[PDB]
Amino acid sequence: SMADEATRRVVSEIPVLKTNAGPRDRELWVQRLKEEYQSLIRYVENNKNADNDWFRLESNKEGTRWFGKCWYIHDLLKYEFDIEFDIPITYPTTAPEIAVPELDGKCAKMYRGGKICLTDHFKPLWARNVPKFGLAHLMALGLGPWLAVEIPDLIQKGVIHHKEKC
Q1: Which residues cross the membrane?
Q2: Which residues of 28-50 are buried (b: 16+ CB within 10 A; e: fewer)?
Q3: Structural domain spans, the chain
Q4: How far apart are CA 114 and CA 103, in angstroms?
Q5: Residue 98 in contact with residue 115, Cβ under 8 Å?
Q6: Which end of the chain is flanked by fewer CB atoms within 10 Å, N or C?
Q7: CA–CA separation, 33 vs 59, rounded Å?
Q8: What backbone phi and psi angles, to 5 degrees, belong to 65?
Q9: What is the SS3 string spanning 11-44?
Q10: Which residues on adjacent β-strands are paired with residue 83?
Q11: Sign of CA pseudo-dihedral 103, 107, 109, 112
């Protein structure tokens, strides 16, 4: 399987998650969040060592609302986009929907409101791996490759401009 090897190559040094818990699940949700944070922070460390430190995320106290920034490099210029998502009640079987609100109405591969539209292969890939994938994997396998198509396209179309700073 090309798909299986491509997935492994992208995710193999990201800690796997274990607990089947969503936002309503009390002590099991607290445990799932420990898994989510341990997976995220290892992913960030790996990204720094790879000269690809491309996002920051924080959550509310309950871990049910996430927000932060991603960076994308094109022709050596660095573009920053605010990102956000809610954790669905049926997480982690259901994947969260990442939003890039500043691009609402600017990208065809996006829903009304700024939720990114991934290809059809992402949902069954998430489904086949439940509950091993978490937010680190959603970033690596969902947002990362989405940016790598859509941000070059929107820069070429003159939809995205780089602000002259510093």
Answers
A1: none
A2: ebeebbebbbebbeebbeebeee
A3: 2-156
A4: 6
A5: yes
A6: C
A7: 10
A8: -135, 125
A9: HCCCCCCCCCCCCCCHHHHHHHHHHHHHHHHHHH
A10: 68
A11: positive
Q: Which fold has domain 2-156?
A: Ubiquitin Conjugating Enzyme (3.10.110)
Six token digits for residue 114: 């700024």
Question: In this structure, what token pair is assigned to residue 139?
Answer: 């970033």
The resolution in angstroms reads 1.4
Amino acid identity, position 77: L
User: Per the structure block, which two tokens stand in for 26?
Assistant: 């009390």
Nearest CA-CA partner of 17 in 63, 56, 52, 54 = 63
CA dihedral sign of residues 28, 7, 135, 86: negative
DSSP the chain: -HHHHHHHHHHTTSPPP-----TT-HHHHHHHHHHHHHHHHHHHHHHHHTT---EEEEE-TTS-EEEEEEEEEETTEEEEEEEEEEPPTTTTTSPP--B-GGGTTT-SSB-TTSBB---TTHHHHHHHTTTT--HHHHIIIIIHHHHHHHHHHHHHTTSS------
Please check whether residue 50 is in contact with residue 9, taking contact to mean a CB–CB distance below 8 angstroms.
no
- Active-site pick, 70, 107, 117, 166: 117
Structure tokens at 142: 């969902």
